[model samples]
Target: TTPTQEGQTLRDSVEKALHNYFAHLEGQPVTDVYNMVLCEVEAPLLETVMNHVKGNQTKASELLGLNRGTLRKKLKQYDL
Candidate 1:
């Protein structure tokens, strides 16, 4: 919550990760990267959210700003 934490936010981490991802690709052609990164990040995100909410799908969905049914679909999609 301090000013120092402002520069080291989740956005910073994600930006760093994305930069590394592209860097490590070594000029390789890529496709489906949007959904690919989304899927990769989404599973862990939902897992943590579910844990935070103590497995309460309703609350988890609200926290994620997703519809309950959509959250269920994602949970199933990632086998969470």
Candidate 2:
């Protein structure tokens, strides 16, 4: 059973990771951070959803609120 604990949320994790990333940047100019984060998050999201539905693209697409074609394109993009 899933616990109802008040654990860290995804937003909190992303904020913490971004802060750590900037800290490690050490004044280096940041570029494409948006797409960088998107790429990092999207692949695993698609992979997990696909796995959860046993690679049923239609079901995964519906669950993800994405069109089947769009989901296919993203799956292709990540070679998943």
Candidate 3:
């Protein structure tokens, strides 16, 4: 499911949940929660795309539209 509909579906569901739960806090500070959500999404997105590209930084970077250095930074952040 890494690069399939399942992966997209799960991300969509998660995003929906985030919106549903946070919508009521229309004026509350929620930057921390928003950052956490982005972190969650970024981690899996990079990992799964890396798997699909057979762990090739060049290919994965191209596919992800991120620089090789940027991808390396993300991998490190996620302890991958």
Ten consecutive residues with minimal summed lDDT in candidate 2? 21-30
- Across residues 1-80, which tens digit of lDDT does each residue of candidate 2 receive? 78687878999989998888888779877789899999999988889888899998889989989998988999999875
Residue 64 accuracy (lDDT) in model 3: 76
What's the lDDT for all of these models? 0.86, 0.88, 0.81
Model 3, runs deviating above 4 Å: 1-15, 23-31
Q: Per-residue lDDT of 11-77 in model 1, one digit per residue for the tens? A: 8888999999888898878999999989878888879888889998989888878998888998998
Choose the strongest candidate by lDDT.
2
Higher-scoring candidate on TM-score, 2 or 3: 2
Model 2: CA > 4 A from native: 1-5
Model 3 lDDT tens row, 25-63: 778765677688788788888788888989888898899
- The TM-scores of all predictions, comma-separated, are 0.80, 0.87, 0.66
* Global lDDT of model 3: 0.81
For candidate 1, list the clashing residue pairs, or say none.
none
Stronger candidate by lDDT (1 vs 3): 1
Runs in model 1 lying further than 4 Å from the true structure: 1-7
What's model 3's lDDT at 15? Answer: 76
State the lDDT at 1 in candidate 3: 35
By TM-score, how accurate is candidate 2? 0.87
